C-alpha cells in the first residue's frame, strides 16, 4: 500500500475491510457500499458525491444514476450517466 486507506475520506469504510489505492478503493460492504466506524454501520456508497453525475445524481442504493434537469431543466439520456435535453 501507500497511505491513507480507510481514512483518506471523513468516511469511507471505518477501515473496515477496504482495499485503499493511491486514489481509490475497495471494501466488505456490499457493492462499492461506503462502511463507517463512528456507526460501524454499512452504507452505500456515494458514487455521485465523488464525481460522477453530471447535474443530477440519483444515487440508488449501491448502483449510483446521473441525470440532469436542474440548472437547464432537460432530462437524462440514454446512457444513465450523462444528460441531455428534449422537447
Ligand atoms: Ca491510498
Ligand atoms: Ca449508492
Redesign the pocket.
Known sequence: ?????CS?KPSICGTAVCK??????ECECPEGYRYNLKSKSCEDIDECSENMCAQLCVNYPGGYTCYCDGKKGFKLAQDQKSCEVVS
Open positions: 500500500k501507500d497511505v491513507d486507506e483518506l485503499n489505492i493511491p486514489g481509490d478503493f
